[PDB]
CSV table of C-alpha atoms and ligand atoms in Angstrom, one decimal:
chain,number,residue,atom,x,y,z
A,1,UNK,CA,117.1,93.1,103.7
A,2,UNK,CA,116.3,90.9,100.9
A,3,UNK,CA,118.2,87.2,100.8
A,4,UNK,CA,119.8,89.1,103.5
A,5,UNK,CA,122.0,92.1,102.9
A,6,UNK,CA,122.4,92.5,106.5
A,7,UNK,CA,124.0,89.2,106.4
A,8,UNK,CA,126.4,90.2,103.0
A,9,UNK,CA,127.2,93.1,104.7
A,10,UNK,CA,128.3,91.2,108.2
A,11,UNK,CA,130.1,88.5,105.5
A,12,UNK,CA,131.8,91.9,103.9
A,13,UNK,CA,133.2,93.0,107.0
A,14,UNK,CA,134.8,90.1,108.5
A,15,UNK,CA,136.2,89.6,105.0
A,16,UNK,CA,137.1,93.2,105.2
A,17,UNK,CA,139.7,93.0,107.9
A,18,UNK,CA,141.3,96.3,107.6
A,19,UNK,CA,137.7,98.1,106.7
A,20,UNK,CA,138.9,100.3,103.6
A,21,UNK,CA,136.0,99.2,101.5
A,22,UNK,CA,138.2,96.3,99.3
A,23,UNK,CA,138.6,92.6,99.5
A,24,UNK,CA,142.0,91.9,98.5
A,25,UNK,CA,144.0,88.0,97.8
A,26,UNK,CA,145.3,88.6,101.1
A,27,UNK,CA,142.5,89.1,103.5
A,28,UNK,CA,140.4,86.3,100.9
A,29,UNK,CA,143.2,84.0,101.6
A,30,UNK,CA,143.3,84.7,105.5
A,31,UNK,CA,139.5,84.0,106.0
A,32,UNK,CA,139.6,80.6,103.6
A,33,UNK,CA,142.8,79.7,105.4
A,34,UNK,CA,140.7,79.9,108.9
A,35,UNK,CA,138.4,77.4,107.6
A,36,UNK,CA,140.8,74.9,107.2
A,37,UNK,CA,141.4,75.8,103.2
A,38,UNK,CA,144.7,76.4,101.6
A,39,UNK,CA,144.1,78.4,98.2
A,40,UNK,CA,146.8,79.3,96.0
A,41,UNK,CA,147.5,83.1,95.1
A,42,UNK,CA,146.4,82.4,91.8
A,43,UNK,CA,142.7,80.7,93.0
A,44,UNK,CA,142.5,84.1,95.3
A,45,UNK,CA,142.9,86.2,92.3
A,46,UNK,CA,141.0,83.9,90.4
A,47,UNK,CA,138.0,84.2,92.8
A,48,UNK,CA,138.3,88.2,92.5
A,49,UNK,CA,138.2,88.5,88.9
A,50,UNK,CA,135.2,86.6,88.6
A,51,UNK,CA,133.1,89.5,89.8
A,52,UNK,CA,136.2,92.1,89.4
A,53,UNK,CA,133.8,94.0,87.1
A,54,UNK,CA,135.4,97.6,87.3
A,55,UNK,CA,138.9,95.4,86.8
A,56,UNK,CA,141.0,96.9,89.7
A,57,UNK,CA,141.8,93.3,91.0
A,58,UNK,CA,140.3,93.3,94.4
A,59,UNK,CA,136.2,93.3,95.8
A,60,UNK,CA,134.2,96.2,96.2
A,61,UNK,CA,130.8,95.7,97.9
A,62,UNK,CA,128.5,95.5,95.4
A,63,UNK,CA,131.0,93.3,93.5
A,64,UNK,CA,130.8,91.0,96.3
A,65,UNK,CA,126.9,90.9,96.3
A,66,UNK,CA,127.7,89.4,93.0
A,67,UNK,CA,129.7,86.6,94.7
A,68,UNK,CA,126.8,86.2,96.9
A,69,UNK,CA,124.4,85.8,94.4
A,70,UNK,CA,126.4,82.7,93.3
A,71,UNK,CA,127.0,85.2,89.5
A,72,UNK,CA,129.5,86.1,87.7
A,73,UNK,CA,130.1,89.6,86.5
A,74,UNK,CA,128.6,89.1,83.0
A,75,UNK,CA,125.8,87.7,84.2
A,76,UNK,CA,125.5,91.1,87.2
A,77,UNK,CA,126.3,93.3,84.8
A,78,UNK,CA,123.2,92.3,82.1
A,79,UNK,CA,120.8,92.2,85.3
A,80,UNK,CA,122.1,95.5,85.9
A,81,UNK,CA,122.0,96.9,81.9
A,82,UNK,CA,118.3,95.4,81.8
A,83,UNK,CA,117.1,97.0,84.9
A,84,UNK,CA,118.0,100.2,83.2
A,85,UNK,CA,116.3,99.5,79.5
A,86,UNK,CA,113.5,98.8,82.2
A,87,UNK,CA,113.4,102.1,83.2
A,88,UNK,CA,112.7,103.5,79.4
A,89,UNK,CA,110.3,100.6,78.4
A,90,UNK,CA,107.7,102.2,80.2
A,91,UNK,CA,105.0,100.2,78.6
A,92,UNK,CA,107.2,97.1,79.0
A,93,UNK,CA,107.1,95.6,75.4
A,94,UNK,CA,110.2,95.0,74.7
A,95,UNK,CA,110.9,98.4,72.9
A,96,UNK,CA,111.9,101.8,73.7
A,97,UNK,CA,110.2,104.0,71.7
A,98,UNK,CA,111.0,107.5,70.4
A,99,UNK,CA,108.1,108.7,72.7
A,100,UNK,CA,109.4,106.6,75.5
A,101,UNK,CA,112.6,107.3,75.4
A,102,UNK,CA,111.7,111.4,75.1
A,103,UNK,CA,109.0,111.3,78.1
A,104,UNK,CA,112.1,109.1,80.1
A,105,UNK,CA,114.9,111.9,79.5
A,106,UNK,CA,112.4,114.6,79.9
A,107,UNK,CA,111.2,112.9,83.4
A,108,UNK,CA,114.9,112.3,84.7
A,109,UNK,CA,115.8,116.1,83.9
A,110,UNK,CA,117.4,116.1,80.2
A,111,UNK,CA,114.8,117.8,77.9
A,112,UNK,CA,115.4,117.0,74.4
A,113,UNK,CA,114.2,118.0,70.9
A,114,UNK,CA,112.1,115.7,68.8
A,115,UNK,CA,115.1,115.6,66.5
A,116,UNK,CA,117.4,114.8,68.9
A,117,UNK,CA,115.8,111.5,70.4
A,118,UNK,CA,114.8,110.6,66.4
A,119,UNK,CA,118.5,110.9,65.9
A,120,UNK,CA,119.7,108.3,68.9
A,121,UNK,CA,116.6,106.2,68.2
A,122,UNK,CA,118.3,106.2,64.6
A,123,UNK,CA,121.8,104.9,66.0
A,124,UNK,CA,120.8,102.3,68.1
A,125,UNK,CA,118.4,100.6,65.7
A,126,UNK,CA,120.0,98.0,64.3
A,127,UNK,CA,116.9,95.2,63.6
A,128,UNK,CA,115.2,98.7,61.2
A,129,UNK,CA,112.0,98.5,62.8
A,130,UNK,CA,112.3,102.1,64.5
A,131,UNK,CA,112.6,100.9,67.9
A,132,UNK,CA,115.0,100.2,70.0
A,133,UNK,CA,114.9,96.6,71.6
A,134,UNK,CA,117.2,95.0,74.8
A,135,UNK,CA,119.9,93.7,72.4
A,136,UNK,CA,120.4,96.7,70.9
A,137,UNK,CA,120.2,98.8,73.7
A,138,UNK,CA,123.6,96.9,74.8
A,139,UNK,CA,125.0,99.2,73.2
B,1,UNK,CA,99.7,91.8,80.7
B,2,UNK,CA,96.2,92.8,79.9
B,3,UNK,CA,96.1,96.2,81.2
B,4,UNK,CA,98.7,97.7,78.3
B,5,UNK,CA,97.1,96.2,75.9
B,6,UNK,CA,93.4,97.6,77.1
B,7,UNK,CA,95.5,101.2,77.3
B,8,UNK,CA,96.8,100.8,74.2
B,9,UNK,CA,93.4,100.0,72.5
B,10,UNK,CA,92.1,103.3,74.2
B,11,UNK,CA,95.0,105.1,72.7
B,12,UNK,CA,94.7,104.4,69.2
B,13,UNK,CA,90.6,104.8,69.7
B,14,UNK,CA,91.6,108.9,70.6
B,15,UNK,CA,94.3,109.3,68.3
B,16,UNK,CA,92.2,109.2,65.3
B,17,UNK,CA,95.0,110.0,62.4
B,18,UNK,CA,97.4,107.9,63.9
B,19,UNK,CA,100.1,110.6,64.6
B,20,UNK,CA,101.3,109.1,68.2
B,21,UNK,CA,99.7,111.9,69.8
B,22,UNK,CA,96.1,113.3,71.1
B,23,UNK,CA,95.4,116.8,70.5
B,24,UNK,CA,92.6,118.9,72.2
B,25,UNK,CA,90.4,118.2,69.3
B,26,UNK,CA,90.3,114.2,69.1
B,27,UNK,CA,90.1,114.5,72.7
B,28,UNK,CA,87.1,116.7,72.4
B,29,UNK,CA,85.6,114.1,69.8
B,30,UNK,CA,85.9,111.6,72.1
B,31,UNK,CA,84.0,112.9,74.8
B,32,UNK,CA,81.3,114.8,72.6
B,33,UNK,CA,80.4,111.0,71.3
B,34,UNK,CA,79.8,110.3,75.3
B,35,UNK,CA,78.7,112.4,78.1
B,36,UNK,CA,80.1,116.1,77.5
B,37,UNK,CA,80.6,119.5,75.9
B,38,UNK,CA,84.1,120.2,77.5
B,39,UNK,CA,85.3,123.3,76.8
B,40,UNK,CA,89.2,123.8,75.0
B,41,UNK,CA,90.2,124.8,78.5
B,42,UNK,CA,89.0,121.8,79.9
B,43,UNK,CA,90.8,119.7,77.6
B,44,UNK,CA,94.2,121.5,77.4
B,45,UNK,CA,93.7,121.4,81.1
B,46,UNK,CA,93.3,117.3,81.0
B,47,UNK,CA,96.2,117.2,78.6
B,48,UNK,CA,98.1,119.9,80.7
B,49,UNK,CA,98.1,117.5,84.2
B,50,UNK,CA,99.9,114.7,81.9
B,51,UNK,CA,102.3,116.6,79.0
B,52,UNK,CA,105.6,116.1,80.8
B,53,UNK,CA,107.3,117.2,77.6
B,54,UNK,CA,104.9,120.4,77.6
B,55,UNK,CA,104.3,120.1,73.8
B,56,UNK,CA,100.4,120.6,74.2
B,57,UNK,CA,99.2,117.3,73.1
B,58,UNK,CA,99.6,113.6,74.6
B,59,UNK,CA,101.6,110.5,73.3
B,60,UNK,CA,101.5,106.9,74.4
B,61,UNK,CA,103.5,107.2,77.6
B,62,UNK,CA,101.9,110.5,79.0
B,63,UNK,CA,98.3,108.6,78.1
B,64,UNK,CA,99.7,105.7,80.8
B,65,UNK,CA,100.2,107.9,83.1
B,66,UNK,CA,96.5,109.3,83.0
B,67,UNK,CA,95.4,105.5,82.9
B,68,UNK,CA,97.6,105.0,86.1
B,69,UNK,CA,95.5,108.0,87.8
B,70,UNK,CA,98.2,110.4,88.3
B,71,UNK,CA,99.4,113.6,87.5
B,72,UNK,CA,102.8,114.5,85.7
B,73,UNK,CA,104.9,115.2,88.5
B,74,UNK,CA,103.9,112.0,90.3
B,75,UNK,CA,104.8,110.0,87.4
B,76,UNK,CA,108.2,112.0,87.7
B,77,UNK,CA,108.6,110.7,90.9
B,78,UNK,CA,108.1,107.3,90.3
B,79,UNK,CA,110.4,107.3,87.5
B,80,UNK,CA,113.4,108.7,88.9
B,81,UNK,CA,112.9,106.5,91.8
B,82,UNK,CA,113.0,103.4,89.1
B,83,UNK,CA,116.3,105.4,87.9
B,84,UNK,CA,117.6,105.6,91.2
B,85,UNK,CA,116.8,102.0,92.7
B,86,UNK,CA,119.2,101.0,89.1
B,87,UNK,CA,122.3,103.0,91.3
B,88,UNK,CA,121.4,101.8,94.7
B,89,UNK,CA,122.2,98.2,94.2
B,90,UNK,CA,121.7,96.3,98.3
B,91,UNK,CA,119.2,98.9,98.3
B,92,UNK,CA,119.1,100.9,101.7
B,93,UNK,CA,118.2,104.2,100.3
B,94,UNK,CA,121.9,105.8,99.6
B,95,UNK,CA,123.7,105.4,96.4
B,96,UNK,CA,127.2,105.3,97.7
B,97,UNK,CA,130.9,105.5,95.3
B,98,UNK,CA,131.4,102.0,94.9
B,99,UNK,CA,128.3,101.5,94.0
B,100,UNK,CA,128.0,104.6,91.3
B,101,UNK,CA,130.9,103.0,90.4
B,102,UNK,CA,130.2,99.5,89.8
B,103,UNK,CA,126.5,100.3,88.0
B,104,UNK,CA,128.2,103.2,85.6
B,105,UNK,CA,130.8,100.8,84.7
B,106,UNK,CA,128.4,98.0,83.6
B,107,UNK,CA,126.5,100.2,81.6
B,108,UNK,CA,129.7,100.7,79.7
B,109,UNK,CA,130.6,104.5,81.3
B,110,UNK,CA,134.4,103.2,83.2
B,111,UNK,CA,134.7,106.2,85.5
B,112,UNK,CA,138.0,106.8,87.3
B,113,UNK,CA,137.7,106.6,91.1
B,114,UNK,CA,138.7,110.5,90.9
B,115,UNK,CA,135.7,111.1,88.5
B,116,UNK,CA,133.3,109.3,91.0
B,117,UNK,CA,134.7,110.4,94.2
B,118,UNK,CA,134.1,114.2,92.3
B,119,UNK,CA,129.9,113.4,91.4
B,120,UNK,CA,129.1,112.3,94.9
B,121,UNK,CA,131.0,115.1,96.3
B,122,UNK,CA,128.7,117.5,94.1
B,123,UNK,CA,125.3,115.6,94.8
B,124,UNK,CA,125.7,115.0,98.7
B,125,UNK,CA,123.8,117.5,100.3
B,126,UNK,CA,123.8,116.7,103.7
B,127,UNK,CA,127.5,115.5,103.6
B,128,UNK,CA,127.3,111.7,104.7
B,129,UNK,CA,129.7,110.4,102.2
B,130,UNK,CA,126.0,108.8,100.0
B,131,UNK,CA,123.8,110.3,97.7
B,132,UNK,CA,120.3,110.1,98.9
B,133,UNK,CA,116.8,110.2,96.6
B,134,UNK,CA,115.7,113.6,97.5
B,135,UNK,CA,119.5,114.4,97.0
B,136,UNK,CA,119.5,112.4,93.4
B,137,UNK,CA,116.1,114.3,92.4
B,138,UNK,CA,118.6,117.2,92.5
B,139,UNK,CA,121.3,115.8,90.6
B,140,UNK,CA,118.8,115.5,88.2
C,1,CA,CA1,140.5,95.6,102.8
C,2,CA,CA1,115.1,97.9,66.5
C,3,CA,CA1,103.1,115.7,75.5
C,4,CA,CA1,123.0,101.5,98.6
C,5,ZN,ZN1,136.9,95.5,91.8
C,6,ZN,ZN1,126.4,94.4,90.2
C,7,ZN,ZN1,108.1,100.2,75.1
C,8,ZN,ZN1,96.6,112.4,66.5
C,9,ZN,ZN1,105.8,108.4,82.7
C,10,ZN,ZN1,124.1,112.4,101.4
């Protein structure tokens, strides 16, 4: 456990009265009213959406290891994004290359033809310099 | 940091012509000019334990994984693992639906909870509910 999941995952479960894997306003607002605090139904829903990042209004777990890290969901989800570029960049430059990104697909099963990876390294360059960097991997 | 660009200098020393790739014969060069007389079998052998793509010659990324000191498959390995460790987000080993979920979603795939529910169903092998690595190897 890292800055403790163990703990997040005790955290989750309290929070988690009913254990069906969700947070909602209701059992947020019964855990905050227990320490002596007395949030409105809109600060509850408030709260959620600032790491609602799959938008169904309530708190997942990992969503909730967002809360813990003190983040937003922007912020989670361009740690997460990054983490996978990471995984192409093999020489960690900056850059996915056409090689790179052909030696990545073939490794994680999808086998491609040279003009298939030329063709979504085409696409996603937007800068012209016939790579693809983090920005443009974004999208 | 230092090591990349060392690789990278070795690289472009092989790869004579520039293509992005070293064939049999500019690796053959290469270790003609120092100690050897390999013969073609030996070298499409050395090329052979890194072409992950199987196209008989080496790029940049297969030449790291010589440079690392490891075969193919064990660069495989480590890569998926990098893939899988994106998915398994408090990481304890199992990727489970909310987390497929919440990781697809922010790299812009929004999957319905049916749609989710569905992959892990088809990757869980020993039916715990969590896809495992050896179990995302195969989902692979
Ligand atoms: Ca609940
Ligand atoms: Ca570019
Ligand atoms: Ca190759
Ligand atoms: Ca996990
Ligand atoms: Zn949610
Ligand atoms: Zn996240
Ligand atoms: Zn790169
Ligand atoms: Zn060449
Ligand atoms: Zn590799
Ligand atoms: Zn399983």
């Amino acid at each position: 456990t890292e800055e403790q999941i163990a703990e997040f995952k005790e955290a989750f479960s309290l929070f988690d009265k009913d254990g069906d894997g969700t947070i909602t306003t209701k059992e947020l607002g019964t855990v905050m009213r227990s320490l002596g605090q007395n949030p409105t139904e809109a600060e509850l829903q408030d709260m959620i959406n600032e790491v609602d990042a799959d938008g169904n209004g309530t708190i997942d777990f990992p969503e909730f290891l967002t809360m813990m890290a003190r983040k937003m969901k922007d912020t989670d989800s361009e740690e997460e994004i990054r983490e996978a570029f990471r995984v192409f960049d093999k020489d960690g430059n900056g850059y996915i290359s056409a090689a790179e990104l052909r030696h990545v697909m073939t490794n994680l099963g999808e086998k491609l033809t040279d003009e298939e990876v030329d063709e979504m390294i085409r696409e996603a360059d937007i800068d012209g310099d016939g790579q693809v960097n983090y920005e443009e991997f974004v999208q």
